[PDB]
Amino acid sequence: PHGHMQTLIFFDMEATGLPSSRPEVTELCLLAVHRCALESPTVPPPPRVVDKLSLCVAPGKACSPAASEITGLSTAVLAAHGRQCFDDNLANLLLAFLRRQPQPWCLVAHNGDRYDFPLLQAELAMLGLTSALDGAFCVDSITALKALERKSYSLGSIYTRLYGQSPPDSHTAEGDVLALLSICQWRPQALLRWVDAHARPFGTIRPMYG
């Protein structure tokens, strides 16, 4: 018996590779927007009032050449920049950031069901924090945007169809979240309605592995 989502947390991660490789997180971005920014609003500017967290993470293994080409990250470069692994302090930081947002929380990620949600659950499981985000909800924006539009349903393809130019910085987690936000601002009332109707408990997401 959940109510209306109060915060939409636009969410994207980079990783060492695709799911079949048992990947690890290399970058994450959370962009928390209060529902009022969508309910009561060429390309729309982001809301003035948002919370943002963008962090790089040292994975415990090498990125694949393909992963490095598309994400612009490598394990060696992350290490040169002194990045720390996905550890208890990181999980605590994520939770403290989420706690600054009104509940209910809904993570919104493009192909989140395939990529971002199961990998986040796997990282948390490795720390023994298997219930840390049980109270959050989640939606996959490709599922939402397909349903609403009813071709390619990549961020870039959607954005270009809606706006005309290409999105900026397609190759970072932050760039992806910002493009997703812009898409979500096209018809924001409808998007928000769909999320409220379809949000799933994060606890129902199985870890990608382990």
Binding site for ligand A1B7U (CB under 6 A): 12-15, 17-19, 23, 64, 66-67, 70-71, 110-111, 115-116, 119, 154-155, 176
Report in angstroms how near the CB of residue 111 gets to its own copies at its nearest.
22
Q: Does the annotation place 176 within a ligand binding site?
A: yes
Q: Look up tokens 């096209």; give the residue.
A: 186
Query: Choosing among Mg ion, its own copies, ligand A1B7U, none, which partner's interface includes residue 53 (Cβ < 5 to 8 Å by kind)?
Result: its own copies
- C-alpha to C-alpha distance for 64 and 71, rounded to whole angstroms: 10
Q: Which amino acid is at 209?
A: Y
Contact stretch for Mg ion (CB under 5 A) within 8-16, 22-30, 53-61, 128-136: 8-16
- Which spans of this chain sit near its own copies (rule: CB under 8 A)? 6-7, 34, 36-37, 48-56, 72-73, 77-78, 80-84, 89-90, 92-93, 96-97, 99-102, 172, 174
For Mg ion, give the closer residue by CB, 133 or 180: 180
24 scored as a contact of Mg ion (CB under 5 A)? no
d(CA 168, CA 166): 7
137-140 and 200-201: which strand pairing?
Answer: antiparallel
| 144 assigned binding-site residue | no
Name the binder of 174 from ligand A1B7U, Mg ion, its own copies, none, CB < 5-8 A by kind: its own copies
Q: Is residue 10 within a helix (H) or strand (E), and if so which, with residue range? A: strand 7-15
Q: What would you report as the CA-atom Rg of the chain, rounded to the nearest whole angstrom?
A: 16
Cα angle vertex 170, ends 108, 92, to 5°?
Answer: 45
23 binds, among Mg ion, ligand A1B7U, its own copies, none (CB under 5 to 8 A by kind): ligand A1B7U
When asked if residue 123 is in the footprint of Mg ion (CB under 5 A), the reply is: no
Q: Is 198 a catalytic residue?
A: no
199 is known to lie in a ligand binding site: no
Decide if residue 12 touches Mg ion (CB under 5 A): yes
* Cα–Cα distance, 182 to 116 (Å, whole number): 19
| Cβ closest to Mg ion, residue 12 vs residue 123 | 12
Spatial neighbors of 69 by CB under 8 A, at least 6 apart, are none
Distance from C-alpha of 158 to C-alpha of 174, rounded to nearest angstrom: 17
Q: Which two tokens stand for residue 62?
A: 């090498």
Q: Output the known binding site for substrate.
A: 14-15, 115, 176
